[PDB]
């Protein structure tokens, strides 16, 4: 409850809200779900001046993402979707469309903001640990146990981000990850120490 508030205070320095009209209550709900991430990661994001940009429209309508217009994201071959239609982005930056958090809202991630932010944690905070030898061994055994095996089972950085999201979204998804991917669950458990 207190670390939740502390994480929300940290996020107030990371989250950028869009200009103009947007769904405020849902924006706050997205931040609330982000607050479940271990505070150690959020503070690292804050130190690197990583911004979580909440958007009222397409990602590609932002100047910094205009170069991705018409670009098919990694692993989206055959989906017919380009970055113009994708509601979330993570890595060196984080950009998220308000209202698209839940699985099925233009994506099949367990939660949009946690998945995208996990990428930034992976890349900025953990220096691409998803591509380390340790995790690749785990990814080789369990990367196909969370569905979407041609995306999660193929890219370790995506399996990491999606497992991270399962681990921190809520208690139900946390239990599901443990049963499905016990070595990944333990990996993320140790990472947070």
């Amino acid at each position: 409850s207190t670390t939740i508030q502390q994480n929300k205070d940290t996020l107030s320095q990371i989250v950028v809200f869009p200009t103009g009209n947007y769904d405020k209550n849902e924006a706050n709900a997205m931040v609330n779900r982000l607050a479940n991430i271990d505070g150690k990661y959020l503070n690292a994001l804050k130190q690197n001046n990583l911004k979580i940009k909440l958007l009222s429209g397409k990602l590609t309508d932002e100047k910094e993402y205009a170069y991705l217009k018409g670009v098919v994201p990694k692993g989206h071959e055959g989906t017919g979707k380009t970055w113009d239609d994708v509601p979330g982005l993570g890595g060196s930056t984080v950009a998220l469309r308000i209202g698209f958090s839940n699985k099925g809202k233009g994506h099949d991630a367990i939660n949009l903001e946690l998945h995208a932010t996990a990428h930034a944690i992976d890349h900025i905070v953990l220096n691409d640990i998803s591509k380390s030898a340790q995790f690749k061994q785990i990814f080789a055994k369990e990367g196909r146990s969370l569905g979407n095996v041609n995306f999660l089972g193929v890219y370790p950085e995506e399996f990491f981000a999606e497992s991270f999201a399962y681990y921190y979204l809520n208690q139900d998804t946390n239990s599901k990850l443990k049963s499905a991917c016990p070595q990944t669950y333990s990996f993320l458990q140790n990472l947070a120490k």
């Binding site: 990694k74 979707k81 509601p87 982005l89 993570g90 890595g91 991630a109 950085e157």
Partner: peptide
Amino acid sequence: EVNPPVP
């Protein structure tokens, strides 16, 4: 670096 969500 950029990474998309699960399709």
